[PDB]
Amino acid sequence: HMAKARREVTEKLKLIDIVYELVDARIPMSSRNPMIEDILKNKPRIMLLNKADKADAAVTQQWKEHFENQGIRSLSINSVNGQGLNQIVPASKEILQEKFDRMRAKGVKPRAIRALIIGIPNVGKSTLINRLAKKNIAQWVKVGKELELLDTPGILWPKFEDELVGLRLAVTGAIKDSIINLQDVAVFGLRFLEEHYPERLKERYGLDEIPEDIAELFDAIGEKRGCLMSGGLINYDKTTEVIIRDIRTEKFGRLSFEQPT
Ligand SMILES: Nc1nc2c(ncn2[C@@H]2O[C@H](COP(=O)(O)OP(=O)(O)NP(=O)(O)O)[C@@H](O)[C@H]2O)c(=O)[nH]1
Ligand SMILES: [Mg+2]
């Protein structure tokens, strides 16, 4: 993991011209893997804010400006329906123009661009590859006569100690919900919604007013959806799942858990 997947990237980097770093548009910063980026020094790259359809469009625009102003070419895309994928090859050619023109002038003929797909788990690396390759393949994945891709497994990093970063990753689905306390993530989700998207929270569960006590809000949602366990008692485990499901399936509309600056 922290070593296995890491060396796999270190090796494959020697065979590629450019890196396609996929991040979750809902959390462009918290979904960036510092451990991996460190290995990516000097190698050309494009930051791909995937799942842009699930994020707040205005905030996404802010993140793109933020990265570009730092010298990082960025593109917001939807790997499921194709939004923005037509900009990847064009961008890649512009970034590698100098390198390629230099090789051509030295007598080395042009070859198909070789790119590496990297990113945290569940960010959409396979979806993107399958869409670009126009085939269910997800090793050198061919994409027309202009691109060749290499896929890598989802990777996290050791010191992500910042509890906030962990909560954002957990709520968005970057971590298997089996090894974590899902209710704490649901509590984080609800507080986030109450602070940033209160109207959506109310309409979603038909709440005339949002309860001041987080536990009370859990009960409201439970009974509302019928999450009962022992002849009437609220099942908080099932209620937790509903909340997490609602957030991930866009039941609260487009969400962005962080903004630049
Ligand atoms: N709305 C939306 N969903 C997307 C997008 N890209 C991927 N997804 C969804 O996100 C989920 C995970 O995608 P997947 O390609 O398996 O991710 P991955 O990064 O290859 N996973 P791993 O790291 O485990 O190999 C899938 O349910 C997929 O349909 C996107 O742009 N928009
Ligand atoms: Mg995959």
β-strand partners of 252: none
Residues 154 and 165 in one domain: no
CA-based nearest residue to 241, from 180, 168, 162, 159 = 180
On the 0-12 / 13-18 / 19+ scale of CB atoms within 10 A, 196 is: middle
- Which atom of ligand 1 is the closest one to the Cα of 155? 23
Q: Which residue, 75, 115, 68, 113, is CA-closest to 93?
A: 113
Quick one: 89 and 198 in the same domain? no
Segments forming the whole domain that contains residue 61:
4-159
The rounded Å distance from CA 207 to ligand 1 centre is: 32
Burial (CB count within 10 angstroms: exposed 0-12, middle 13-18, buried 19+), residue 88: buried
Q: Residue 86 falls within a domain, yes or no?
A: yes
Query: Measured from the CB, is residue 33 less than 6 Å from ligand 1?
Result: no
What is the secondary structure of 180-246 as a DSSP string? Answer: S-HHHHHHHHHHHHHHH-HHHHHHHTT-SS--SSHHHHHHHHHHHHT-B-STT-B-HHHHHHHHHHH
Is residue 116 in some structural domain? Answer: yes
- Of the three residues 132, 159, 186, the one that is the final residue of a domain is 159
Strands 147-151 and 113-118: parallel
Find out whether the beta carbon of 123 lies less than 6 Å from any atom of ligand 1: yes
Q: Which one of 159, 177, 203 terminates a domain?
A: 159
Q: Is 53 in the pocket of ligand 1 (CB under 6 A)?
A: yes
Tell me whether strands 141-143 and 147-151 are parallel, antiparallel or unpaired: antiparallel
Give domain status of residue 260, yes or no.
no
Pair type for strands 113-118 and 74-76? unpaired
How many domains, the chain?
2
Mark whether 222 and 122 lie in a shared domain. no
Helix ranges, 106-181 (H): 125-133, 163-172
User: What resolution does the deposited structure have, in angstroms?
Assistant: 2.0
For 132, half-sphere exposure in the C-beta direction (CA atoms, 13 angstrom radius) is 31
Tokens representing 197 are 């998207």
- Report yes or no on 172 lying in a domain: yes
CATH number at residue 187: 1.10.1580.10
Using what technique was this structure determined?
Answer: X-ray
The CATH number for 143's domain is 3.40.50.300
